[PDB]
């Protein structure tokens, strides 16, 4: 499996299959979905690393959308990515 071979947590084959159903080009590459799954894996393991750091900087057990809204608009690490986003909280 290319996901374990690339040592990732996201499925490369699903990112490639989502690039196929989007018809973003005529033909993909061999290692393009491994790179894209490793970047999206990095962004998820950077946002949820901070949501899990902020939940224990508090007594909460799960991760609520209030934690995502409080982290992503603070935390100048990824606050530039969410200048124009709104977590719905409903």
């Amino acid at each position: 499996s290319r996901t374990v071979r690339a040592e990732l947590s996201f499925s490369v084959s699903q990112v490639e299959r989502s690039l196929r159903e989007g018809h973003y080009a005529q033909r993909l590459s061999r290692t393009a979905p491994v790179y894209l799954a490793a970047v999206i894996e990095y962004l998820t393991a950077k946002v949820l690393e901070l949501a899990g750091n902020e939940a224990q900087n508090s007594g909460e057990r799960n991760i609520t959308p209030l934690l995502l809204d409080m982290v992503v608009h603070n935390d100048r690490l990824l606050s530039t990515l969410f200048n124009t986003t709104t977590i719905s909280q409903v």
Binding site: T84, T85, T86, I87, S88
Partner: protein, 76 residues
């Protein structure tokens, strides 16, 4: 009517915005800004619904209309 956007709801939006004191003429200006914002977003949501041959404005048509203004909305 636009009069449903009441005086204390605009006051609560300004208190969350950090405003300490509000003049007595903000209330009709804020309704005129909210009506322009809704006339700009609902036009695009109705355009996506008429393009999708539907009669029900779903929440993804609203997410696409807010995406066409640089106001991406997560959670729908």
């Amino acid at each position: 009517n636009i009069q449903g956007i009441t005086k204390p709801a605009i006051r609560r939006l300004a208190r969350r915005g950090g405003v300490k004191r509000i003049s007595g003429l903000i209330y009709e200006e804020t309704r005129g800004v909210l009506k322009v914002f809704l006339e700009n977003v609902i036009r695009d949501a109705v355009t996506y619904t008429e393009h999708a041959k539907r009669k029900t404005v779903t929440a993804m048509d609203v997410v696409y209309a807010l995406k066409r203004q640089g106001r991406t909305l997560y959670g729908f």
